[PDB]
Amino acid sequence: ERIPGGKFTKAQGKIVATPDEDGFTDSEVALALIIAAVVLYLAIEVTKSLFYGEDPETTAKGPMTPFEKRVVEKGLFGSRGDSYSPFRP
Amino acid sequence: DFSKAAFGSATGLVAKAASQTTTAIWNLHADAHDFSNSSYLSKQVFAANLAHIGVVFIWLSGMHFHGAYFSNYLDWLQDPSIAPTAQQVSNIANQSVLNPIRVTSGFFNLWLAEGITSTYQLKVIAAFGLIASALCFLGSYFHMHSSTSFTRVLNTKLTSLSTHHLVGLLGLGSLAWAGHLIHISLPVNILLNAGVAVPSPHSLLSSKAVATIVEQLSFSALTSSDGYVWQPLVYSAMHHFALALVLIVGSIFLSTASNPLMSFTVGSSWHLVLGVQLFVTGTASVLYAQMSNAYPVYPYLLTDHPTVVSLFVHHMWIGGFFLVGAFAHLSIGLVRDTLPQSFSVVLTQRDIILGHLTWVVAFLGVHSFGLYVHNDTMQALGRPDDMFSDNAISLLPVFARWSTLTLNSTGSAVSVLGVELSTADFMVTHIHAFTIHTTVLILVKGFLYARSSRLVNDKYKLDFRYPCDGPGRGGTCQISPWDHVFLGLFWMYNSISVVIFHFFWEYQSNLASIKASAGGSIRALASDFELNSINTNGWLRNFLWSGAAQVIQSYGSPLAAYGLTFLASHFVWALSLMFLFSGRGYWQELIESVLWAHHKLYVVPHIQPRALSITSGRAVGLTHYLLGGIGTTWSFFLARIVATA
Amino acid sequence: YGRCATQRYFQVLGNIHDIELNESLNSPQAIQALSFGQLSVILLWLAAYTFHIGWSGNFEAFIDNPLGVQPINHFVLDPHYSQYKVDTTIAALTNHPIYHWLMTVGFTSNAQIYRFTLGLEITAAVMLVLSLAPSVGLLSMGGLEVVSWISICWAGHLVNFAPGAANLTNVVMEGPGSLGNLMNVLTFNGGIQLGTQALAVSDVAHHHVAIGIVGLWISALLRVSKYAWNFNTQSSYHLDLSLSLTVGGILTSLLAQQAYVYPALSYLPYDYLTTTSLYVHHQYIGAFLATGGFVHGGIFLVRDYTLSNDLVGKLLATKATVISTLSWITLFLGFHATGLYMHNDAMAAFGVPQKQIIIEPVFAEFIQQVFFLGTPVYGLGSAAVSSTPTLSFLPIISGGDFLVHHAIALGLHTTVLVLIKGALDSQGSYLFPDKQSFGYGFACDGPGRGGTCDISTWDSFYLAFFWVNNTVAWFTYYFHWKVLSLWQSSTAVFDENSLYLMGWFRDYLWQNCAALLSGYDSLGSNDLAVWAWAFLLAHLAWATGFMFLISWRGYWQELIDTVIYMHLKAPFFNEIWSADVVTPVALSIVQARFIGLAHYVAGFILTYLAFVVGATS
Numbered sequence A: 001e002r003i004p005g006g007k008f009t010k011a012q013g014k015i016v017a018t019p020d021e022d023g024f025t026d027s028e029v030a031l032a033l034i035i036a037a038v039v040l041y042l043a044i045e046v047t048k049s050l051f052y053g054e055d056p057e058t059t060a061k062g063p064m065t066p067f068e069k070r071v072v073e074k075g076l077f078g079s080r081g082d083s084y085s086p087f088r089p
Numbered sequence B: 001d002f003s004k005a006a007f008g009s010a011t012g013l014v015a016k017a018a019s020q021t022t023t024a025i026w027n028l029h030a031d032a033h034d035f036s037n038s039s040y041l042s043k044q045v046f047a048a049n050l051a052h053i054g055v056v057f058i059w060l061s062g063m064h065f066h067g068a069y070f071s072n073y074l075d076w077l078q079d080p081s082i083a084p085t086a087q088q089v090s091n092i093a094n095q096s097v098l099n100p101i102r103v104t105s106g107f108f109n110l111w112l113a114e115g116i117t118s119t120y121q122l123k124v125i126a127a128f129g130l131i132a133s134a135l136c137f138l139g140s141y142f143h144m145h146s147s148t149s150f151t152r153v154l155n156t157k158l159t160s161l162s163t164h165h166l167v168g169l170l171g172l173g174s175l176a177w178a179g180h181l182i183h184i185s186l187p188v189n190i191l192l193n194a195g196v197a198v199p200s201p202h203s204l205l206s207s208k209a210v211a212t213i214v215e216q217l218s219f220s221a222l223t224s225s226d227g228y229v230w231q232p233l234v235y236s237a238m239h240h241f242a243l244a245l246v247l248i249v250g251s252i253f254l255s256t257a258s259n260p261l262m263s264f265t266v267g268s269s270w271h272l273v274l275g276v277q278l279f280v281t282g283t284a285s286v287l288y289a290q291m292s293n294a295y296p297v298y299p300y301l302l303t304d305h306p307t308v309v310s311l312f313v314h315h316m317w318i319g320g321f322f323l324v325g326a327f328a329h330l331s332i333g334l335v336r337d338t339l340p341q342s343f344s345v346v347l348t349q350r351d352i353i354l355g356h357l358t359w360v361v362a363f364l365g366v367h368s369f370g371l372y373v374h375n376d377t378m379q380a381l382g383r384p385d386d387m388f389s390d391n392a393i394s395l396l397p398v399f400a401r402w403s404t405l406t407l408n409s410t411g412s413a414v415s416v417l418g419v420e421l422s423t424a425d426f427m428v429t430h431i432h433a434f435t436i437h438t439t440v441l442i443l444v445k446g447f448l449y450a451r452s453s454r455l456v457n458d459k460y461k462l463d464f465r466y467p468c469d470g471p472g473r474g475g476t477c478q479i480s481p482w483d484h485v486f487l488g489l490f491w492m493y494n495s496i497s498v499v500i501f502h503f504f505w506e507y508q509s510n511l512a513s514i515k516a517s518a519g520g521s522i523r524a525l526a527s528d529f530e531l532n533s534i535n536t537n538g539w540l541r542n543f544l545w546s547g548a549a550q551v552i553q554s555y556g557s558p559l560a561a562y563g564l565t566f567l568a569s570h571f572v573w574a575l576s577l578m579f580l581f582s583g584r585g586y587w588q589e590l591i592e593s594v595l596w597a598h599h600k601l602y603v604v605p606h607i608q609p610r611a612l613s614i615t616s617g618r619a620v621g622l623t624h625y626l627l628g629g630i631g632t633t634w635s636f637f638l639a640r641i642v643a644t645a
Numbered sequence C: 001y002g003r004c005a006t007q008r009y010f011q012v013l014g015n016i017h018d019i020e021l022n023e024s025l026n027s028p029q030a031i032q033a034l035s036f037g038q039l040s041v042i043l044l045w046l047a048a049y050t051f052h053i054g055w056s057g058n059f060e061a062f063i064d065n066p067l068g069v070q071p072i073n074h075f076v077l078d079p080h081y082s083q084y085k086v087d088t089t090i091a092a093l094t095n096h097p098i099y100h101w102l103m104t105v106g107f108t109s110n111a112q113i114y115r116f117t118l119g120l121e122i123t124a125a126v127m128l129v130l131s132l133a134p135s136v137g138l139l140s141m142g143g144l145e146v147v148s149w150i151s152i153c154w155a156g157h158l159v160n161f162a163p164g165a166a167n168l169t170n171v172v173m174e175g176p177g178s179l180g181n182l183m184n185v186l187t188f189n190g191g192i193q194l195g196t197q198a199l200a201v202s203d204v205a206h207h208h209v210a211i212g213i214v215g216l217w218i219s220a221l222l223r224v225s226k227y228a229w230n231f232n233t234q235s236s237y238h239l240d241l242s243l244s245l246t247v248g249g250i251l252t253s254l255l256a257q258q259a260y261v262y263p264a265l266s267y268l269p270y271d272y273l274t275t276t277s278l279y280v281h282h283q284y285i286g287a288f289l290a291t292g293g294f295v296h297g298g299i300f301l302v303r304d305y306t307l308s309n310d311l312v313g314k315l316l317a318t319k320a321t322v323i324s325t326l327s328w329i330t331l332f333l334g335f336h337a338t339g340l341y342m343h344n345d346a347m348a349a350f351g352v353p354q355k356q357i358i359i360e361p362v363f364a365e366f367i368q369q370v371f372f373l374g375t376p377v378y379g380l381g382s383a384a385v386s387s388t389p390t391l392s393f394l395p396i397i398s399g400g401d402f403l404v405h406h407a408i409a410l411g412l413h414t415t416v417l418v419l420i421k422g423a424l425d426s427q428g429s430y431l432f433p434d435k436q437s438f439g440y441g442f443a444c445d446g447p448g449r450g451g452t453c454d455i456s457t458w459d460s461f462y463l464a465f466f467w468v469n470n471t472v473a474w475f476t477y478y479f480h481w482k483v484l485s486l487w488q489s490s491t492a493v494f495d496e497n498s499l500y501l502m503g504w505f506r507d508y509l510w511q512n513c514a515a516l517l518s519g520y521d522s523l524g525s526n527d528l529a530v531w532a533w534a535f536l537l538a539h540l541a542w543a544t545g546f547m548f549l550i551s552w553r554g555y556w557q558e559l560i561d562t563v564i565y566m567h568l569k570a571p572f573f574n575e576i577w578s579a580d581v582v583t584p585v586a587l588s589i590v591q592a593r594f595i596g597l598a599h600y601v602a603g604f605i606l607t608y609l610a611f612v613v614g615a616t617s
Ligand code: CLA
Pocket: B029, B030, B031, B032, B033, B034, B035, B274, B278, B321, B322, B323, B324, B325, B326, B328, B332, B464, B465, B482, B485, B486, B489, B623, B627
């Protein structure tokens, strides 16, 4: 039970109807937590990748894909430049 | 010759191209009263003091003139309960709503305490005040231009100066005021309270009046002399007579052969004397502010609530300002002295004293504001029994609730003054102590780190007022003693604002409580202050927001002026924020663009537009901040206490 | 190790995301990876909201009675609550239109919400995977074509979940059919549809398909315009970032305006608090994005631009004219708005409200009547009444709105003045001719040359952010008071008392704080106690910002030196702490200014949020 505060809550008479049951049970909450744990593992991987930066051999020892080769050659998709610009064209 | 030298500062400003800037004008204003060390420094100081005395005499004459001509002083005499107004407002623009302005300076009560019953007496006092101001101006002129050098008054003739002030000025003035009381202020109040008409005051000096009508020397006179408005004047007369006697006796029974200013230069001696004098005057102002409502001394004073509030708040503000200026001039004297070896123990315990004061301030702040925030949190969480209140954990100020002692024929002030204190009083008193300690911390730090510090080791070479030493050492802004006074002024503003808030809420709470009716005798808590001044939310709701109704709903009423000054004070305070948060360089570049715009149109001012210097900008911001905050509190207090009392 | 000072923290943390200075991940692939990580964080934040709405929330009870139920955000389990407060509180209520959005986009169950949370977590995992492998190949992803395709797909979703989709005959299988068949899911009715009091889902779906197709066409046109006249002469991450931030700020401010006036979420206007919070929040976000566009323009000037005879070179050459004219505009607007407000204050105070200077906003009234309104409300410009009018929530302006809009213009022009002045003086002023060699942010140039406080280009943003917050406060006060008067049916208290600023105090701020302050008192505490507590907390943060802005370093450095002396001289601790490890030093001048600004704006935002909640609750 709540003590209403604010003129509009009293005037409009909106009631905070609590659902009878919970809504997510416990099994589906566990599944959400598992998926969040996988996302956390991926986030740890991303953090380790970004903190130590990109190693110099990759992008230098790994040959560019033919798509990347042709894009850099023709200057597309932000290449032939020094910007990111996700909203390029 | 003299007229030529009157604008000599401006002539020197325009003589050199380096001084053809607006910064030169601001320096000319800032260095106006900064009388440089010279053979005539003492002459200049004394003449300036006498000129200020003349200015104050002009002010007193104007106040008595308004009482004589533009006041309902006679109507107030016939009925003290009416609103004392002493400022007529002409019908220009549309300001006619506020035509009678209720003056809260207490001049009506003062004049009644002086035996003044006719506006002719006020006219005479105004005329004599103008005459005294003219005499003071003549004397100041004379001393500045033709008199002794006065350089011996602080070091050589300090014994003569101190003895004259002790006996002549203080003691003889108190004795003369006691005579005035006993002879014309007591009899006039007797004949006014009894309503038996008042003769000319000189007719009381006839040796045939009540002086010899009855020789009885106690509380017994014609009919029934039971006036309790009159007894405070009797006590004041006795106090002045006793004080004159003790001053005269102790002056000749005192050594006075110890001048601590032998080791200080004349300029530094003057600054140190000014600092100690400012400390004494400020603490005296605070003491009077407390005693005004602590003890009734003026006729029909406590009844006029706006007057009581105004006197308390004004004298608290003046005391705080002068207490800050005390440390300001102590710092000036220390940093501007060649060999200030006298403060060796404190300049060698620099870090010890400063760090212990730092811990004291930290402890007091965390504890006091944590009591407040804890009460806020517990009340928000719905835990009123976990708060710090009387119905909860009680912080009873036990040290306040005891003054019992052996009587030895005493009375009245042998107790806690008949007032009980509670948790709210304890917490607000500790808030006051913490804020005072923080202001003192800033001021003492400015004094101690004035000649040298661990950061900058030659701060004495930088004088008293400098913006910084540079962005080096991580940044050295605001190291100057001037900047420490600048911050201490903000903290004094905070301290005095909280003090006057505490006083005003306690005063309103007591007024509401005594308005029980007569039958209502269980005030429980009630005492809106005692019940609500335990939370920051409690203050914000039941004091600021609650009492702001009077000042914000004043439009169309005589307090519309208070409402407008409330708004203007907020405006000035935000403008201060503008000056304090910003910096000189940006404004200089903006002025460069504006000056290009000027040059494009062949305007080209030669007094080159320069934005305010760093110290000048800080000073302007502080001035606006103090003006805005103090004006907001002024408008709020006056509207609240005049509309509701 | 760690033989640095505490200044190291605030020095690196201020540039911790200045990846251009981070030589390791300096490539644009790393910046795209940062974008992927940020989008993963956004997806997880939306998953948070959806998960707590579906877990402890009344969405199933909300779809049934959207007008009579208050949306629940999450369950409150604060151990500090007292049993009564525990019995008092049900759960944390909702201050955002996520219930309305979910209802609009076709959610009808908590199972759908749970699947949405799982999908959001999976998409965040996908974003993290994409960020794991930065690569020029991934730089191909994005573009206006991609965002237009996203718009088209959203149109498809809205078509699939439009209320009339049940009556829709399958177009791709039975042909397009009659026009009404398509009207079941694609409409252009225009304006509020009554009932839900929001734009029809068919309208939104049709809007999105049209926008996506037009965006595809516009992107193709822009790229053929890049075919001939192919000139990427100035490429900089800060130039493109400024472009994106300015466009995003314009779009977000437009979103606030057109979402108040044309709500797209069903039964949203019935919820006053969520509407006000939406408008205020989006306007703050838009102003922040525009300020960021200006900031990154200044940064591009500082360290990525080379002087040429181009657009920027022309702007720089006549920067004195720009700054001077902006200063004139701001001076005129401030002088006149402040003077008219003070005149109205004096007239209302002196009991003569008729003698106020009320300049009727005849130009905006002319625009409104001629272009927007379908009935004669003012009668100027046109008086025709529309035979078949459409509905919306466009406010009806009056005399006070003229002064308020002039205040808004003053705020915007002053903010632009500060930002443009700082950006263009990053190339140098006569007080600092060599600012091109000092970087975007620095303390000062010392006390010499009269003083050089706040002369840095970053200090220009620092000064202009106060003006950003002030302008947003001005027009959000305007919007909030206007909608409060409309909802409370006053509409005349506003139109009269907004002419003078004492009205803005008494009737808006002092009046609307009555319920908020009663959140908790001696009698007890109600549901507004949290917001009164946040009000006080925000005031405390604001005044701490005052501390960091007014008092400057040197004092504090000396005080910290004395505190270090106390520690080194203290017993039982000089054996353990020699101040060599993470030496405690006072905050640098730039760090202090930023932290003071941060406290100032944090208190600003939290104070206004608490006030909005306590006023429109
Ligand atoms: C007995 C009182 C007294 C005396 C004689 C002095 C004397 C002096 N002080 Mg000092 N001071 C005092 C009290 C006093 N102070 C107090 C109480 C404070 C704390 C607030 C200070 C703080 C202080 C600082 C911080 C400094 C001085 C300085 C000085 C010296 C130069 C002053 C100067 O040029 O100002 C010229 C006069 C002015 C600038 C007056 C301008 C008006 C002020 C700034 C604001 C007034 C606003 C007004 C009240 C509101 C307007 C009305 C409104 C309705 C619009 C001089 C020796 C300076 C120095 O270098 O000393 C060597 C200096 O830097 N003082």
